[PDB]
Every structure is written in C-alpha cells, then in structure tokens.
Amino acid sequence: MQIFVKTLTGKTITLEVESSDTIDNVKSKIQDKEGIPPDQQRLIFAGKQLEDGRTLSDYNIQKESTLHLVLRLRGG
Amino acid sequence: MQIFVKTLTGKTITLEVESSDTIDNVKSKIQDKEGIPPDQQRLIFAGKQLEDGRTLSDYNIQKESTLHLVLRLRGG
Amino acid sequence: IKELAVDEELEKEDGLIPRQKSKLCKHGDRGMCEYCSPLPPWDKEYHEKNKIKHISFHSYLKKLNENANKKENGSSYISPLSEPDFRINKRCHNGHEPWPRGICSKCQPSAITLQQQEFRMVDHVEFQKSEIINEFIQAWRYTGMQRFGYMYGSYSKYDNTPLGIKAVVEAIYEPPQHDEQDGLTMDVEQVKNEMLQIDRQAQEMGLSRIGLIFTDLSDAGAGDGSVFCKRHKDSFFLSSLEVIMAARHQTRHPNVSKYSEQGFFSSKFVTCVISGNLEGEIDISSYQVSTEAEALVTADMISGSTFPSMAYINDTTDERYVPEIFYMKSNEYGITVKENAKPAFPVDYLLVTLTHGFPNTDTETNSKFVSSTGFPWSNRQAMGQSQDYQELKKYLFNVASSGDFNLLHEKISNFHLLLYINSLQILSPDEWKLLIESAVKNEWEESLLKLVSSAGWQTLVMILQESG
Ligand SMILES: [Zn+2]
Ligand SMILES: [Zn+2]
C-alpha cells in the first residue's frame, strides 16, 4: 500500500508496505535507497517509538498514512 | 578552479579561484567586484566558518561547490 | 462594497466639538448665536491651537461632503474623492486625437504648485512593547550593518485627535536581505515570493502588513556617544532613494473606500525610520508620503539624484510628458515668488509627519504577543539566531519535560515561533488554525487542553526528544 515516509528534514519519499507486514521490511527499504543502518533508523508514530521487531497491526498503520523518521547525526 | 559564492538574497556570485591558495585571496577577489572590505567578511562552508589563514585543501572544498557570504564586524 | 470595520465607525460619528457660554454672547441661555455654536471637526484653527498639524482625513471627508451634498436638489451622489491624475488622456475629447500630434490645455497636466497636504490618513502610530523593537536594534549591535523589516498590525480609534485613526503594530517580520555598511538594496522578487506565504498566516491570526522599518545609525565612537546626528533641520529628513520604496509599497496596498469612484483611495501605510535624536539617543521618528501629488507621479516620473534632499526630474520620451515643478525659496536679498526652472527639486516637502509613542506599562487593553521576544527570528542569517530544531529543545521543550499550562501557554503565543511550526506542517491545517487562535485570544484554558490531548502535539514532542 501507499505510505508517506518522511524524515526529520522534511523530505517525504513514497514507499511500499503490506498491511500485515513487519516494520523491518521498511527498515530494509531505507537501508537500500538511503543506506542507513538500523541503529539510526528511528520511526515514530502516534507519539511512541516504533520498535524494530513489531508489525503494523499493533500501531494500526493504514493506507496513505504518513511516517516520521529520525536520523541520528553526531560528531563522535 | 570554479567556485560559487551565494549571499542571502538568492544571488550567486561567480569566481575563479586557484585550488592551492589561501582564503584571504578569496575575500580579496570578492572585494574588487563589489567594494566590501574583507575585515568584516566571513565565509560559511555548510555551517562551518572558513578561517582566512588556511587554504582550500584542508577544508576539502571541491570544484564549483556552493559557498556562503556573510558580513559581521568584530567591534560592531 | 464593504470598507474596514474601523473606517465605518469613524464615518458614523459626527465628532462635533462643544463650546460654552461667553461674555460675547448676547442671546439667551436657550440658544447659540455664533460663539457657542458646535465647532466643526475640520477647522484647522482648533487644530493648531492644540498643536495638531493635520486635519484628520475622516473630518476632511466631512468637509467635502458639505461641498458635494447641499441643501439644493443635486440628485447626483458624486462624492469627489479621487486621486488627481497627472497622466495624459489619449482620447482628449477634441481634434488633437494623438498626443504625438497635438495637445491642448484640457488634457495637459497643470504646473505643480507644491502645496503641502493638510490631511494625513494615519494620525498617530503606536507600538505594543519596548522589548519588541529592542530586538531589532540588537540585530545592528551584533553584525554592525543596517537592517530591514515589515510591520504587521491592526487599527482602532483614537480619541486624542478629533475623528482620527491610530495605528497599532503587533510583530515585525524581516525579509532576507543583503546588508551593507552604507545602505542596503535587496531583490524584490524573492521578497514578494516570501511575503505571499506570510499573508496566508496573517489572515487567520488577524494581522496585516501595514508598515516597514529600516535602520540608519552611524555610531560615533562606541564610547560615551550613542550615534551621530545625520537627519536634522539643515540636512535631509528622508532620502530620495527611500521615497521610491515608500511609494511602491503604498500602491501595492490600497485602502477600500465606498466614496471613491475607483473603489480604492487614501492608503493607510506607515514608514518608520530609526535615525536618532539631535543630542544623544536613538529615538525614532516616522513620516508617511503624500497622496495628492507624489503618489501618482511615482509611476512615471521619479528619478534618483546625488543629493539626499532632492530628486532629479528627467525628460519626456514620446509618452512621458511632465509639467514644470515650482516652489518658493529665499534669494540672497529677499523672499521671492517661484523660481524653479531647474531640476533636483526637494522631496522633504511631500512628507506629512506622524506622532509615534509607546503605551504605559501599568495598564492596557491587551498586548496579545508578549511571549519572550527572544526566540531566533526567521530570516536573521547575518546574526547567529537562525537555528534549526536544536533551538526548540532550548526554547520551549515542554518545560522541564512536564510543563504547567500557565507556564506553557505563555511561551506559545510568539509570532515567529508559530510561523516556524507550520512551515514543517506536521499538524493538520484545521488543528493548526485552532492552535494559533488559542494563543492569540482569551479564555484559552479549555482549548489548550484540547491541543495537548491531540495526537499531533504528542508526535511533535516525541520527534523533538529523539533529535538534538
Ligand atoms: Zn452664542
Ligand atoms: Zn485634450
């Protein structure tokens, strides 16, 4: 289904996910086209930090729903 | 060889600088085109302020990269 | 057509000035002959007695209604309140149908007498807080160069001036400009594209761009003396280059009026300048331009001169016919009649003054925008206060990670903080419109709890805590 993956810098990129798929397929999709390892791939929905080992049925992710991604930036 | 210095008003200034010179010569070249003294001038390279005593190689500034120009007096 | 809510209230009230009985009255107590009759609000003799130098245009509208509407039949409703035109009618209603071949006196613009305007649109500009414009001068104290801004505000009645409108300002927005030590000049295209989106958020908040400010300080020695004295009686009051920027801003923002035939007349726009007093401080002053002559000739004939007091008059190229400009000045022996057969005529004559001031701190009706006035502004890239989301952890943070609603709502009513949030457009536009209306209006306690219970504000504090 169609979703709106939006990072912290306002860049929204359209991705694809199944309604019963896990969130690790989304984390693997960010690892493909953005090259981010999963220690910095932080998705947030409904004010809660989405764990990497869960599915979309717990957070009730529906079609055409936006996503809030946080990327870690550090000097050390 | 080529470089691009851009102000805050959306105006990019073309300049041809050597790859192995100092930053003070870059401030002298933008002085001759407009008439701004290089004491209050400052150069921002992606959020990093360029020091006038250094060169173009230690900051790893590549060809025709977008630069920033800002004016800030020391006493003022 | 519909005018403003402030403009219709000044029209309904007559604004008569009452008088008392006198020794010169010979009539009885139940009457009035001439000496205790009600005084008209447009008499300039009463104006200069209380040192009011203009006749408060809504009363000037009343003094022309007596000339338009009479006791006779009439049956016209002309209401001659229009902009006097100096352009040339091409059809000309005569036999000289092209202007390349023929011009007579009924279409020729007459010689400009240079008579001063006796009425001003805005009678008194007022401010909201001394901490608001203190941040504007603080921008000069960090980068040492001049600044620029636009003032957003509203209007209401003024009881000091008879039938007068006062100008209230609420917040100041700064466009992105290129600063310089001598003066300043920015691109008009990127400013107009930036000002289009600020007018969107100003509609729901009840704001309107009605003013602008630009600085001119020239610090003397940075010790005992504050600034130099550039603008005085012998020098220029307003430079001729800034007359052009003041004239184009008034033509872009017209004022709706039912009495005018074109539908718009008598623009309510203020131009304020920070220049400093004569002796020792940085006291400001404001003047606005004249509608009678300067407002229409700026479309064709205003050219820049090397003198700041005067402006050059250029020549005619096949469509731009201009009349001769005359003014009176003293010669080496006496005072003479109009002499000007020479260019570079002064522009300080075409300015009408205003009375600026700040209200008392002990009481007011409201202030509506005093949150901190210390938040980093949107386009202050010359200064260091142009931060990213690192500032939102420092500024508000939902204070101490658990905030009281009396201490949380007092920070949320900032103008530039609310204009920074909706640019990210995390919240819905319906939830954002009730967010800005809660911060600017009263009885906000029942609607602030509606904001914290929404999932959009929960996602805003969750995406801020993980980021730096
Ligand atoms: Zn009487
Ligand atoms: Zn004619």
From Swiss-Prot, chains A, B:
Every Ubiquitin-like domain range: 1-76
UniProt effect for mutating K63R: Deficiency in ubiquitin-protein conjugate formation. Loss of DNA repair function
Crosslink site: Glycyl lysine isopeptide (Gly-Lys) (interchain with K-? in acceptor proteins): G76
Localisation per UniProt entry: Cytoplasm; Nucleus
Protein task: Exists either covalently attached to another protein, or free (unanchored). When covalently bound, it is conjugated to target proteins via an isopeptide bond either as a monomer (monoubiquitin), a polymer linked via different Lys residues of the ubiquitin (polyubiquitin chains) or a linear polymer linked via the initiator Met of the ubiquitin (linear polyubiquitin chains).
Designated name of the protein: Ubiquitin
Species of provenance: Saccharomyces cerevisiae (strain ATCC 204508 / S288c)
Residue range from the parent sequence: 1 to 76 of 128
Swiss-Prot record, chain C:
Keyword Nucleus: yes
GO biological process, one term: protein quality control for misfolded or incompletely synthesized proteins
Keyword list, A-Z: Cytoplasm, Endoplasmic reticulum, Membrane, mRNA transport, Nucleus, Protein transport, Translocation, Transport
MPN domain: residues covered: 125-265
Protein localization: Cytoplasm, Perinuclear region; Endoplasmic reticulum membrane; Nucleus membrane
Lineage top rank: taxon: Eukaryota
GO MF, one example: ubiquitin binding
Recorded topology in the membrane: Peripheral membrane protein
Quaternary context: Component of the heterotrimeric CDC48-NPL4-UFD1 ATPase complex. The CDC48-NPL4-UFD1 ATPase complex interacts with the HRD1 ubiquitin ligase complex composed of the E3 ligase HRD1, its cofactors HRD3, USA1 and DER1, substrate recruiting factor YOS9 and CDC48-binding protein UBX2. Interaction between the complexes is mediated by interaction between CDC48-NPL4-UFD1 complex member CDC48 and HRD1 complex member UBX2. Forms a complex composed of CDC48, NPL4, UFD1, DOA1, SHP1 and deubiquitinase OTU1. Interacts with CDC48, UFD1 and VMS1.
Function: Substrate-recruiting cofactor of the CDC48-NPL4-UFD1 segregase. Assists CDC48 in the dislocation of misfolded, polyubiquitinated ERAD substrates that are subsequently delivered to the proteasome for degradation. Involved in the import of nuclear-targeted proteins into the nucleus and the export of poly(A) RNA out of the nucleus. Required for the proteasome-dependent processing/activation of MGA2 and SPT23 transcription factors leading to the subsequent expression of OLE1. Regulates ubiquitin-mediated mitochondria protein degradation.
Remaining remarks: Present with 1050 molecules/cell in log phase SD medium.
Family that this chain belongs to: Belongs to the NPL4 family.
Name of the featured protein: Nuclear protein localization protein 4
Organism per entry: Saccharomyces cerevisiae (strain ATCC 204508 / S288c) (Baker's yeast)
Residues represented out of the complete protein: 113 to 580 of 580
